[PDB]
Amino acid sequence: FLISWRGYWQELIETIVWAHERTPLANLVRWKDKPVALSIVQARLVGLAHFTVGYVLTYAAFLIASTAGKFG
Amino acid sequence: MALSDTQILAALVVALLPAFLAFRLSTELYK
Amino acid sequence: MSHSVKIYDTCIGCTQCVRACPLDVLEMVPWDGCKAAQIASSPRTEDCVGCKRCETACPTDFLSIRVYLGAETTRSMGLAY
Amino acid sequence: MTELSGQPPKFGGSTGGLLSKANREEKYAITWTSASEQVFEMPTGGAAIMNEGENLLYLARKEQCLALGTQLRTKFKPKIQDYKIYRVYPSGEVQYLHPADGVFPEKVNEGREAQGTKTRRIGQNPEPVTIKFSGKAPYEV
Amino acid sequence: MAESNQVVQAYNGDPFVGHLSTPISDSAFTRTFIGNLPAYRKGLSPILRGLEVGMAHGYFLIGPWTLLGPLRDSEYQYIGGLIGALALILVATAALSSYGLVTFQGEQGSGDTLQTADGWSQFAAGFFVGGMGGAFVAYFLLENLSVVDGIFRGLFN
Amino acid sequence: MDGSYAASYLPWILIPMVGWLFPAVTMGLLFIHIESEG
Amino acid sequence: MDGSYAASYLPWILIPMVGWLFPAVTMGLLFIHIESEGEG
Amino acid sequence: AQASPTTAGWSLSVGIIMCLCNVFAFVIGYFAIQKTGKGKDLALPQLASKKTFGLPELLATMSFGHILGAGMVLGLAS
Amino acid sequence: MTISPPEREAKAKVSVDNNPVPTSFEKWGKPGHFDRTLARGPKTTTWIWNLHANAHDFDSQTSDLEDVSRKIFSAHFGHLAVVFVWLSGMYFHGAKFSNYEGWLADPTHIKPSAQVVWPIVGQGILNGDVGGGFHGIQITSGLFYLWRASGFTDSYQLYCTAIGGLVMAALMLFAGWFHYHVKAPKLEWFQNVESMMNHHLAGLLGLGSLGWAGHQIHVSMPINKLLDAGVAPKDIPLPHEFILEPSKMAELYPSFAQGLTPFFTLNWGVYSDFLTFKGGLNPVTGGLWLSDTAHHHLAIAVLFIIAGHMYRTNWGIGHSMKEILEAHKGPFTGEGHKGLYEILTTSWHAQLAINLALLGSLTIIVAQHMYAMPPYPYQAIDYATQLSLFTHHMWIGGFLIVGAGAHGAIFMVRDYDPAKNVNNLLDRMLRHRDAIISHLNWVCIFLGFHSFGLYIHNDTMRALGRPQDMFSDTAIQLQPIFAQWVQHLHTLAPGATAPNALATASYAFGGETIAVAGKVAMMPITLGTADFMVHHIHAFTIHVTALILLKGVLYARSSRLVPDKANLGFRFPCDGPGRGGTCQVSGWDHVFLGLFWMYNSLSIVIFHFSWKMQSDVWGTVSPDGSVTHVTLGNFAQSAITINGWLRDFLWAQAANVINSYGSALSAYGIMFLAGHFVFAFSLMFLFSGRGYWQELIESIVWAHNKLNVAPAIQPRALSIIQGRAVGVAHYLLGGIVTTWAFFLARSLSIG
Numbered sequence A: 001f002l003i004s005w006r007g008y009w010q011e012l013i014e015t016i017v018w019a020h021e022r023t024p025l026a027n028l029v030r031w032k033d034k035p036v037a038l039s040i041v042q043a044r045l046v047g048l049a050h051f052t053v054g055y056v057l058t059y060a061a062f063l064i065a066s067t068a069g070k071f072g
Numbered sequence B: 001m002a003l004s005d006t007q008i009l010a011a012l013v014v015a016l017l018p019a020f021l022a023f024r025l026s027t028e029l030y031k
Numbered sequence C: 001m002s003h004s005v006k007i008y009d010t011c012i013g014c015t016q017c018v019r020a021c022p023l024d025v026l027e028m029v030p031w032d033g034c035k036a037a038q039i040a041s042s043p044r045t046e047d048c049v050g051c052k053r054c055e056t057a058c059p060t061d062f063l064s065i066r067v068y069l070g071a072e073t074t075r076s077m078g079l080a081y
Numbered sequence D: 001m002t003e004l005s006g007q008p009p010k011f012g013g014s015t016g017g018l019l020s021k022a023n024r025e026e027k028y029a030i031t032w033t034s035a036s037e038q039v040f041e042m043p044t045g046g047a048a049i050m051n052e053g054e055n056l057l058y059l060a061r062k063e064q065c066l067a068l069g070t071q072l073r074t075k076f077k078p079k080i081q082d083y084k085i086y087r088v089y090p091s092g093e094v095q096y097l098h099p100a101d102g103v104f105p106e107k108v109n110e111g112r113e114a115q116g117t118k119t120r121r122i123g124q125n126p127e128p129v130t131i132k133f134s135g136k137a138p139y140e141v
Numbered sequence E: 001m002a003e004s005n006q007v008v009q010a011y012n013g014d015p016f017v018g019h020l021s022t023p024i025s026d027s028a029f030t031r032t033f034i035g036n037l038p039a040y041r042k043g044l045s046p047i048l049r050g051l052e053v054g055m056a057h058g059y060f061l062i063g064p065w066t067l068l069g070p071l072r073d074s075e076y077q078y079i080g081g082l083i084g085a086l087a088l089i090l091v092a093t094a095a096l097s098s099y100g101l102v103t104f105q106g107e108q109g110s111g112d113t114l115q116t117a118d119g120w121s122q123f124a125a126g127f128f129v130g131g132m133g134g135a136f137v138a139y140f141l142l143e144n145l146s147v148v149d150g151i152f153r154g155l156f157n
Numbered sequence F: 001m002d003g004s005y006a007a008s009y010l011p012w013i014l015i016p017m018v019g020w021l022f023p024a025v026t027m028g029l030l031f032i033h034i035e036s037e038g
Numbered sequence G: 001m002d003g004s005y006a007a008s009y010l011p012w013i014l015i016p017m018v019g020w021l022f023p024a025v026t027m028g029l030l031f032i033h034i035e036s037e038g039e040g
Numbered sequence H: 001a002q003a004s005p006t007t008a009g010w011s012l013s014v015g016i017i018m019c020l021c022n023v024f025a026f027v028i029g030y031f032a033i034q035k036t037g038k039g040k041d042l043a044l045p046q047l048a049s050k051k052t053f054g055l056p057e058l059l060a061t062m063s064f065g066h067i068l069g070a071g072m073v074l075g076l077a078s
Numbered sequence I: 001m002t003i004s005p006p007e008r009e010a011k012a013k014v015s016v017d018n019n020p021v022p023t024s025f026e027k028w029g030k031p032g033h034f035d036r037t038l039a040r041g042p043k044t045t046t047w048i049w050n051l052h053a054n055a056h057d058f059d060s061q062t063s064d065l066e067d068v069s070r071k072i073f074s075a076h077f078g079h080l081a082v083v084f085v086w087l088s089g090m091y092f093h094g095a096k097f098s099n100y101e102g103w104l105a106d107p108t109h110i111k112p113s114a115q116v117v118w119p120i121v122g123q124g125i126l127n128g129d130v131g132g133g134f135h136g137i138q139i140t141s142g143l144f145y146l147w148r149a150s151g152f153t154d155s156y157q158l159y160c161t162a163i164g165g166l167v168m169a170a171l172m173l174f175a176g177w178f179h180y181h182v183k184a185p186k187l188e189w190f191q192n193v194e195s196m197m198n199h200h201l202a203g204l205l206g207l208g209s210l211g212w213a214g215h216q217i218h219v220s221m222p223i224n225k226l227l228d229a230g231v232a233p234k235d236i237p238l239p240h241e242f243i244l245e246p247s248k249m250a251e252l253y254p255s256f257a258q259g260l261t262p263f264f265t266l267n268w269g270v271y272s273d274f275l276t277f278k279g280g281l282n283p284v285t286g287g288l289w290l291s292d293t294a295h296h297h298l299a300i301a302v303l304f305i306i307a308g309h310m311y312r313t314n315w316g317i318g319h320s321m322k323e324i325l326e327a328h329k330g331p332f333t334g335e336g337h338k339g340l341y342e343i344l345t346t347s348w349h350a351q352l353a354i355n356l357a358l359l360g361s362l363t364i365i366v367a368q369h370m371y372a373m374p375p376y377p378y379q380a381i382d383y384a385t386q387l388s389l390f391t392h393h394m395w396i397g398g399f400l401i402v403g404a405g406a407h408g409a410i411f412m413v414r415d416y417d418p419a420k421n422v423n424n425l426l427d428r429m430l431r432h433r434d435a436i437i438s439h440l441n442w443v444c445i446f447l448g449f450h451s452f453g454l455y456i457h458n459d460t461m462r463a464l465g466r467p468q469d470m471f472s473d474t475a476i477q478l479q480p481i482f483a484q485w486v487q488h489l490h491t492l493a494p495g496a497t498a499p500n501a502l503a504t505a506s507y508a509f510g511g512e513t514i515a516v517a518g519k520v521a522m523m524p525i526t527l528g529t530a531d532f533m534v535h536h537i538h539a540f541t542i543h544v545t546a547l548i549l550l551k552g553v554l555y556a557r558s559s560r561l562v563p564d565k566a567n568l569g570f571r572f573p574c575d576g577p578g579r580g581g582t583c584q585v586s587g588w589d590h591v592f593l594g595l596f597w598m599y600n601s602l603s604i605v606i607f608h609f610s611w612k613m614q615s616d617v618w619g620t621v622s623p624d625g626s627v628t629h630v631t632l633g634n635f636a637q638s639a640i641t642i643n644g645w646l647r648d649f650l651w652a653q654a655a656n657v658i659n660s661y662g663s664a665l666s667a668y669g670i671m672f673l674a675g676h677f678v679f680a681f682s683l684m685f686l687f688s689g690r691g692y693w694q695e696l697i698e699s700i701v702w703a704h705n706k707l708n709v710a711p712a713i714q715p716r717a718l719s720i721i722q723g724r725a726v727g728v729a730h731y732l733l734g735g736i737v738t739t740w741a742f743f744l745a746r747s748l749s750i751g
């Protein structure tokens, strides 16, 4: 989410929307909300959230496991 | 010899071709 | 819904924003505030997507046309589906 | 508004055209008169052939019709400045959209009412604290 | 003009509709095949369509867990596959019913009976019953595979 | 019923298909076609 | 999986209830809610 | 245990195989070459079937004849 | 009016302008002359960056296709000059700064070394002892192996090669100057594609392998036969002594007694003494048989010379490529290739995209072929050389492919005419690009779930103590059945489907374990569940890269979001925050994302190669024959989980790079840290945006104004596109340098 920005995803989602609207049997079902790419700010926020969750969990697992396996 | 196990279920794929072509010929002759 | 497109009194009437606009949001109307005797107008902001081509085009020291993105509709999101 | 005429351009089909929205929500139409049968770029991908005389084309979005209009008026030997763009609703109601008063907006015209006009500079907008707990932003006042 | 050997024509005679008429998207076989699936077969009420779709789906949903789930190497292989399939069909029924609840709040159309609140609820009911029955009947076949084999070989004559 | 020839599992399911599924399907399709339009 | 603590039959049914039933029901309610098109 | 090649060219490899392949290549070239006579360098008095329709056609079909003949010789040579 | 030669038209299709561009040094002192927007004057620092970004963009510089073609021709000359300088420097360093003769005398007990570090600030520790009292940096280019295969013996021969390379560079440089300034070929000359192709197939490829087959038969093969017998390089006669003494050639190959008569009389069989078809590897050196390679280059010369005749030029016989193209059109494709000959003769970016794609694919093919059929002597013994060449050719191919996507998009933006492309292949592909891209997207999702998802499932199952529920050869097996079958077919080819082949084409398909010295040269490479999973990972990543780049090409004109994208250009940041935000819609931005994904793919490819070769191939053979591999055959059980790759591959094999300090390999650990640093550095450019940096520049510029040190060329933050270009460049550089250090240290430490 941080590196690749939005317009590329909106175009891809448009191809996916066309793929759904033209696939029979699946055509029986339609989305109640139009699928769109995440907004620019939303992208920044979601990418930062993944960055931070991974950051904290990685270091926590490392710290805990190293200190527990070694016992100080 | 005896025909291979894999050999018997290989002629059926080839038979899928005259099946398709007979279907096409029937549908065209119906016109 | 739609975005908001305001035109301020620093307008010089060069019309470049109208030519840049790819959705026909803007017009030129007669005015007496500038030499060109014309001011930009946004009578069709419900079609405005907010691509900011007008602002890119404006020559005045800080824009005389300003696009504030607002409530998103299928027309404003550029959706063809 | 009334009824729309014109011949559909010579074209074999694309995947980029109308979707369910065209029947369910809204669509757009562009008409233009051509001097000859000439090839033009389809805004949804591919090359199409416009016919001599009247041509009506249905597109998914207003911006697509306007991109086609700019292409018509900028990329053709005798320029085509005759195209009209309408919004078509599924109720059959047709709404004339472009050019508004018969004249392209790039040039001034009488009888046009200014909208979005602000009788001040950008730097003369009020402070947000002076308008907080209303629903307005400094450009809306 | 002696040039229409092309097989890929405009979809439904409209070249400006986002689709192309191809031997997969719009040929006589694919049309008469998909159009006569229980989802599109004319003269069918929604509950019967759901019944047929559920029968098929619940029947084939036994296999994956049966041969690959965690109970595959236990003495409850077929029972484990059956339980997984029943839970999957229950979740799918909940999903179908929720979709119907949300998509048909407004005005009920008059086109096809399946695309209404009543029609979609009937389709969900049919799907639930058909799926549970198809999973249970494929389970019952697998558990009694010896009698099926003896029948198809004439072993009991 | 059995068969020392290879792929003896093929007639196992192929005899019911030629005798039950295929005839039922063809007869149903032809019946719908006979009684079409009205 | 077992438990020697008091009333160790409680995780037996609470873990499926918290992991399967609670999320299914709350997501279904929130789904029908955010899609509700009642005016207002 | 390699491929044996006739041992010496003498009378069998040449003429009986090579000239025949060149002749049949000239026939197929006279039968199937499109631009038969329009090269930068033209041909000397036609008469027979060698330089009758251009030096380029003759040279190209003789090259193809030697291709056919080398193939024939190496193949039949076992 | 410079140096004017007579004519040299030869009554040909040559047509040149005598002197269109005069030579002068003034435009050197006016940087930015080739662009009108830059010739005015730099007002902001952006002008500077643009000066480098549009240097080779000859299209945006002038509208004359002829001038662009002449520029490209002369730039090709200058580029060949640069490459000639590089290769001549390689030969010079091998001549006067390498232990090539000491290595030739005892290749097994020595290491190839060139480049002597100057002893200063303690960097003299980089001159590690490579053998025979020689101290320097060990090279993994494999130059010594190519030189022994060529038949080099003395440093003076390499020095002559270096002098000749400098002379050839001067030749190419002068040719470029002369053909852009003096005799400049007209546009009509470049458009003879039939002539160009006939010449390239016949004269460039065919005559090249013909001459090299001659050199291999006359110089490489006899010297290599004498080296493999141990005659020692000081006792082997010079290469020309075999031409001056045909008896010396007959004593090594008795076929040379019968002369050229077997050739002219088609008596080729007697040529069996040097034209062979053995198949396997040389037992003494582990490389390919030089007689097999000589016969190969001979047959390739024959095929390419013959192929150089299909196309028509001035003499009527041949083929019109436009005719062959226009003939091919079927019921699914309207008019097929009608109009492709015209765009492949007036658009440079079209040829460039095609050629970049094929050349990148060919370089990948070269890596995958040279690793398993080691063509040079003692190459397979040097696992560092092998791994290095493999990964290098991989990276080169991947970059060329990304460039191919780039220039396809550029063609679409710049040289696409819809009037010249009506109901043909291009038109119909544009008319169903939604179908194409949606299906490629679905295939990419299916591949990601069914390759990486298998790894995640195995990590979770193993963590839970459920090894029987894993995907592995010992549980739920996913056997590469088809690849195993093809390996078996390859093994049985010699004597059966390949009668005249003595051995298998490559022992990686199966057979004996060819071993030279203490190490194993090449042995069968078994394939199992882990190989299945890695291969489908490769499929997934290649398909995703293709998805990104193909989407970039097919929508460079327009999309449902941006219908007039063609007017915005190939390279532009966006078209506003409107429509929800339209960031990275250009073809350039698709190239930008495809760069990262190609990096991902090739990193996985080279990691797979390194680990598989260290686990199931490379190792030490015993006098009994026992094979102890480098990492003890740990691939099958470790390469099936991500934690296995993190521990047994990365963490385990990184032990050499981190402990490299205080030793000759310390520069490798230094560059390891350096690559990590540059990768982290790139994230600032990729994660941020130009507005913040420009606003910070505002305050810094205010501080400059305060002390009156403000510059007239106003500081401006990097443009959006430039921000991304910097980001991707530093990302790729950092990551690739990290893995370069990792691979070199690991492979040099394992002996």
Ligand code: CLA
Residues within 6 Å of the ligand: E059, E060, E062, E063, E064, E065, E066, E067, E068, E138, E141, E142, E145, E148, F013, F016, F017, F020, F021
């Ligand atoms: C990872 C995916 C996966 C896995 C592991 C399985 C696993 C399995 N599948 Mg399934 N399947 C899958 C995906 C999968 N499937 C998909 C994607 C489809 C397409 C939607 C199918 C559709 C399919 C069908 C249709 C059937 C299976 C069946 C089976 C089982 C066959 C093996 C066996 O027990 O032998 C024994 C196999 C048999 C005894 C065959 C049944 C023979 C009956 C009597 C039919 C006779 C034909 C004839 C028309 C009789 C009709 C009578 C009528 C006229 C009244 C097996 C456990 C079979 C099954 O469920 O077993 C009952 C079966 O019928 N699969």
Ligand code: CLA
Residues within 6 Å of the ligand: G010, G011, G012, G014, G015, G018
């Ligand atoms: C917020 C405090 C808290 C937390 C984080 C947990 C965590 C956990 N509990 Mg426990 N529990 C709690 C309070 C809490 N408990 C209290 C106060 C009681 C006494 C009423 C219990 C009684 C209880 C039982 C009987 C069991 C667990 C069990 C569990 C485990 C499985 C989840 C579950 O089944 O819960 C179920 C929880 C309940 C039935 C009671 C509700 C718990 C409190 C009162 C509500 C918490 C609301 C929370 C603050 C809302 C904020 C959410 C936030 C994201 C917005 C899990 C690790 C299971 C276990 O032991 O695993 C082996 C088990 O069977 N809990």
Ligand code: CLA
Residues within 6 Å of the ligand: I072, I073, I076, I077, I080, I189, I190, I192, I193, I195, I196, I199, I200, I202, I203, I204
């Ligand atoms: C048999 C004739 C012939 C040969 C040998 C070549 C060879 C070459 N061409 Mg050319 N070309 C030819 C005919 C030929 N062309 C004709 C008739 C046309 C008109 C349609 C063109 C038009 C054409 C264009 C437009 C371009 C080329 C380019 C190239 C070079 C790119 C390939 C490369 O880099 O490989 C490796 C390179 C080398 C090995 C360099 C050594 C080759 C030297 C320079 C020439 C050989 C010396 C001479 C024949 C005598 C030595 C042999 C003798 C002692 C036995 C290459 C050296 C490209 C270019 O300019 O590259 C710079 C390019 O843009 N060609």
Ligand code: CLA
Residues within 6 Å of the ligand: I069, I190, I191, I192, I193, I194, I196, I197, I200, I201, I321, I341, I344, I345, I346, I347, I348, I351, I354, I355, I356, I358, I359
């Ligand atoms: C799917 C079809 C296909 C494929 C697979 C290829 C693939 C390839 N082509 Mg080809 N091409 C095609 C279609 C195709 N082309 C068609 C239909 C035409 C007719 C217009 C051409 C005509 C063409 C020419 C003239 C040449 C190629 C060459 C090449 C090879 C370049 C390798 C390289 O870049 O390394 C390095 C590059 C070189 C060694 C030579 C570079 C030659 C120049 C620089 C490129 C061509 C210049 C271009 C024709 C200028 C005119 C265009 C316009 C300005 C009028 C490559 C493998 C080149 C080659 O060497 O073929 C073996 C080359 O000479 N192509």
Ligand code: CLA
Residues within 6 Å of the ligand: A001, A003, A004, I441, I442, I444, I445, I446, I447, I448, I449, I452, I453, I456, I544, I547, I548, I593, I596, I597
């Ligand atoms: C580890 C990092 C990471 C991951 C996982 C992804 C994920 C993905 N990328 Mg992406 N990307 C990344 C880094 C990453 N990216 C970076 C750094 C960049 C900047 C260059 C990009 C830029 C980029 C582009 C331009 C594109 C992608 C594409 C894709 C998708 C490919 C389709 C696929 O693989 O199927 C799905 C695979 C996954 C979702 C991986 C996770 C699957 C796990 C194993 C299963 C999870 C189980 C279950 C769902 C858990 C639910 C939890 C429960 C509580 C609900 C995929 C979802 C391409 C695409 O869209 O292809 C269609 C594409 O166009 N990426």
Ligand SMILES: CCCCCCCCCCCCCCCC(=O)OC[C@H](COP(=O)(O)OC[C@@H](O)CO)OC(=O)CCCCCCCCCCCCCCC
Residues within 6 Å of the ligand: B016, B019, B020, B023, E031, E032, E033, E034, E035, E036, E042, F026, F029, F030, F032, F033, F036
């Ligand atoms: C490879 C061969 C390809 C064929 C498919 C093979 C298996 C797939 C079976 C699917 C069939 C599709 C069923 C729906 C097809 C369907 O219902 O179509 C629809 C139609 C009646 O439905 P409607 O007209 O209301 O539907 C029209 C639209 O809804 C179309 O979508 O039925 C028929 O047309 C009659 C069937 C033709 C009768 C064919 C005669 C066969 C008798 C001769 C047999 C010869 C056998 C010789 C060899 C022994």
Ligand SMILES: CCCCCCCCCCCCCCCC(=O)OC[C@H](COP(=O)(O)OC[C@@H](O)CO)OC(=O)CCCCCCCCCCCCCCC
Residues within 6 Å of the ligand: I328, I329, I330, I331, I332, I333, I334, I336, I337, I425
């Ligand atoms: C293991 C391989 C699995 C693939 C088998 C199934 C093929 C999938 C698509 C079927 C049609 C394509 C084959 C006929 C090839 C073919 O050309 O068919 C014929 C037809 C065009 O042929 P024409 O008659 O026009 O031939 C005249 C030519 O000169 C046209 O210029 O192609 C099409 O109908 C367009 C659709 C092709 C695009 C479909 C490709 C989809 C990508 C799938 C990739 C699979 C990977 C393969 C592994 C290498």
Ligand SMILES: CC1=C(/C=C/C(C)=C\C=C\C(C)=C\C=C\C=C(C)\C=C\C=C(C)\C=C\C2=C(C)CCCC2(C)C)C(C)(C)CCC1
Residues within 6 Å of the ligand: E055, E056, E057, E059, E060, E129, E130, E132, E133, E134, E136, E137
């Ligand atoms: C045909 C075809 C095909 C194929 C397909 C597949 C591959 C499959 C399917 C299959 C399936 C999917 C089958 C099925 C079966 C099912 C069943 C057989 C069912 C059932 C049910 C029952 C029998 C009942 C039950 C119940 C109930 C409901 C009630 C109560 C309880 C109980 C249980 C009794 C295709 C398209 C390719 C092509 C064309 C042709």
Ligand SMILES: CC1=C(C/C=C(\C)CCC[C@H](C)CCC[C@H](C)CCCC(C)C)C(=O)c2ccccc2C1=O
Residues within 6 Å of the ligand: I684, I685, I686, I688, I689, I690, I693, I694, I716, I717, I718, I719, I720, I722, I723, I724
């Ligand atoms: C840091 C940063 C800046 C600020 C960066 C600037 C102003 C670049 C500064 C470059 C200096 C002036 C040159 C230093 C590097 C030289 C090019 C190295 C060569 C110098 C020779 C002497 C070797 C941006 O403008 C930007 C824009 C868009 C996205 C991300 C970013 C971003 O991350």
Ligand code: SF4
Residues within 6 Å of the ligand: C007, C010, C011, C012, C013, C014, C015, C016, C017, C018, C039, C040, C054, C057, C058, C059, C060, C063, C064, C065
């Ligand atoms: S571009 Fe700016 S100054 Fe010019 S007419 Fe539009 S609003 Fe006025």
Ligand SMILES: [Ca+2]
Residues within 6 Å of the ligand: E069, E070, E071, E072, E073, E074
């Ligand atoms: Ca189990």
Ligand SMILES: [Cl-]
Residues within 6 Å of the ligand: I462, I638, I641, I643, I644
């Ligand atoms: Cl592990």
